[PDB]
Design a protein around this ligand. Structure first.
Ligand SMILES: Nc1ncnc2c1ncn2[C@@H]1O[C@H](COP(=O)(O)OP(=O)(O)O)[C@@H](O)[C@H]1O
Ligand SMILES: Nc1ncnc2c1ncn2[C@@H]1O[C@H](COP(=O)(O)OP(=O)(O)O)[C@@H](O)[C@H]1O
Ligand SMILES: Nc1ncnc2c1ncn2[C@@H]1O[C@H](COP(=O)(O)OP(=O)(O)O)[C@@H](O)[C@H]1O
Lengths: 270, 267, 282
């Protein structure tokens, strides 16, 4: 066996330290962008409507400030979400086109959603009819089955994290989200999204979530007891789907596929 | 209707919305995992307190810096006569300092080692003070993962003080992910039971030689009372050591339990 | 009464204790102590090199991990944990962590060199192991695992990729990245809801041992399916079938090892003197 001594050697490690490339995502800076009016303000920074100077492509630029990211200590959480959302392409999932950073700032290059959140739509329309609701639920189930196929579970689905494209299509935005040898005790979930889907369908039809109370403790009480009532104008299929989705035992909750097969969904989806 | 080639910088600026020499140092009160505690006095107010020095080296070794920031955030915005007060914190290179309330009578662990057992008056009084501190905690939305005699200090009047704080959108979350947080405060209730037992017997009720034995006992609520544990104390502890959390009493039911009412020197 | 001291004499007291606190001894390794040879493999965080200590000329492995990826993946304390565990662990069937050191950009692990590679490799080559190789591997593994448990260490990643081979083909447990420090801090004050499904014991390993035995004799693990759901379902129901060629003593040991209820699984000494093991191993 042959061994290298000192220099010729110390150069080996520093050569392979650079053949450790990992620069394989399009490179970006702030100068590639025109900045427009603010789309929103957040806990860690601000979102601006922006344009790539070259292509004129309209988009959203989320600036997060590394100062208040180091405070709450969510850096690696953010790396997780970013690596997730970068490798994820679907018409009902808001695209992460890219990301970059300087010091004190990390920028997220995101798809622009011109029709805002489903939360604002709910605030302005008070309630949705069954066509709009079933179409939202269909797009949601599509994005969620695509997500579950990529082994990623999004379990913070809610009208504030649902944006709308130009055609009014729903788009999931937030992503805050060994085996063959593991024993039973260490491996005993996705159905959580089915529950959230039931809650969302109810809120779309009625105007508020089925367990809303003026105190959080009362809502604990209602959720644990599955205590809620349907107003008159909620139809039977709608009632049927929402009741199937809001089962206390997660393994009694249908499969997203069954949701997409549900007769109410098929009849009302646009 | 826009363009650029400053704004963000502005929006950033907008988003950006103690010293050791201030103290006389007294005798050391104890040395622990990450540093030492010294008795101290404010040079200006002549107010006695304790100064905990943690050394940033081992803090970064054990990887607990964010955990410690959380500890201090929780404890500082918390003032109750049975919770050790965090007056403040500061730091220099290689050192973080905690300015804390001074507890002159030490830990309940040392007292329990000295006396082996506590009588019923002292025990029920400790439980009263603990339940008061814990109800205040739960009101400020804070659950203490582990109260235990090593984390309980004693003030000048021998009153209890909770010192450590180790592991201290619904409407869309399913029931399986709520019960936990919905009956999460009952954790403390269980611990209270355990503590009461250890206050009267001298050792906790699930003590074993191996950790798997202790797991088995805790999961099955397998424990026995010695002779000298009286009727009402057995009742309180048995109420508190219920396997199902919702079957455990409320803190205000503990504070009104007949045994506690009869034997406690505090309201 | 209490006495309080101001000025220099006070701060020097804290300073003194600072100096007395420092109580952490380890040998001061450096890159200059090593002659580097050909690469042995690549990893998520760096490269393994065949290396030699300058003075002894003693041959070993030098695993270089780059702090950049360690910081990105947020695995720094996980690595510190696994290094602490593997360092204070000396057994003939456990790959030896001679030491570790670091410089900005790099942390180096000085490791025992295993010249015959991974058991995963040889299972790929031979597709299946005969009962003699299998029983011998299980014997060496049970020895290493009983040593691990006795020093309060639950490895949790028993698998052919984590098993290396010495110059004589003897087994070496290699990756301690999921390994954990067993309890005994106390559980005396923990309620049932915070230890039932969230806290295990060493029986984990026993289960894996079973799996491994199966995979040694059959070619694939016994709960293999396409996606997690199926495999999870099979594991939770302990649904597996033996091929016809698996002899009955092997079936007995694997069925004893793969029990849903942890404390029903045998103890390592029961495995080591199981009749099949005794008959087929050295
Ligand atoms: N890609 C986008 N397109 C259009 N509007 C957006 C986009 N991202 C964010 N917004 C607006 O900014 C607001 C706040 O979003 P932000 O703070 O970034 O995320 P979070 O949902 O975590 O609060 C949203 O309510 C939305 O109206
Ligand atoms: N505020 C305080 N008042 C009096 N004694 C204290 C105080 N804080 C710590 N001590 C002493 O230090 C010891 C506990 O040290 P501490 O740093 O709290 O433990 P740990 O380092 O394990 O968290 C006890 O013996 C106790 O007497
Ligand atoms: N101590 C060793 N002796 C000989 N070869 C080794 C040693 N450690 C690793 N190798 C080889 O180098 C490769 C890299 O392995 P390793 O870095 O341990 O995997 P990972 O980075 O996934 O933990 C392995 O596939 C193995 O073939």
């Amino acid at each position: 066996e042959d061994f290298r001594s000192g220099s010729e050697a110390f150069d080996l490690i520093a050569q392979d330290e650079e053949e450790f490339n990992k620069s394989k995502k399009r490179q970006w800076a702030l100068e590639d962008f025109e900045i427009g009016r603010p789309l929103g303000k957040g806990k860690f920074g601000n979102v601006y409507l922006a344009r790539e100077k070259q292509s004129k492509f309209i988009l959203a630029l989320k600036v997060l400030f590394k100062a208040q990211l180091e405070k709450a200590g969510v850096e690696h959480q953010l790396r997780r979400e970013v690596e997730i959302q970068s490798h994820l392409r679907h018409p009902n999932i808001l695209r992460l086109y890219g990301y970059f950073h300087d010091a004190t700032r990390v920028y997220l290059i995101l798809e622009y959603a011109p029709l805002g959140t489903v939360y604002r739509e709910l605030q302005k329309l008070s309630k949705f009819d069954e066509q709009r609701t079933a179409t939202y639920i269909t797009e949601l189930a599509n994005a969620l089955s695509y997500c579950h196929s990529k082994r990623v579970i999004h379990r913070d689905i809610k009208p504030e994290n649902l944006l709308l494209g130009s055609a009014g299509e729903l788009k999931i935005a937030d992503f805050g989200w060994t085996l063959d040898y593991l024993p039973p005790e260490m491996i005993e979930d996705e159905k959580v999204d089915l529950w959230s889907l039931g809650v969302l369908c109810y809120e779309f039809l009625v105007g508020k979530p089925p367990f809303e109370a003026n105190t959080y403790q009362e809502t604990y009480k209602r959720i644990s007891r599955v205590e809620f009532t349907f107003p008159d104008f909620v139809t039977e299929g709608a009632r049927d789907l929402i009741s199937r989705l809001l089962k206390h035992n997660p393994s009694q909750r249908p499969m997203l596929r069954e949701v997409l097969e549900h007769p109410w969904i098929t009849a009302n989806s646009s």
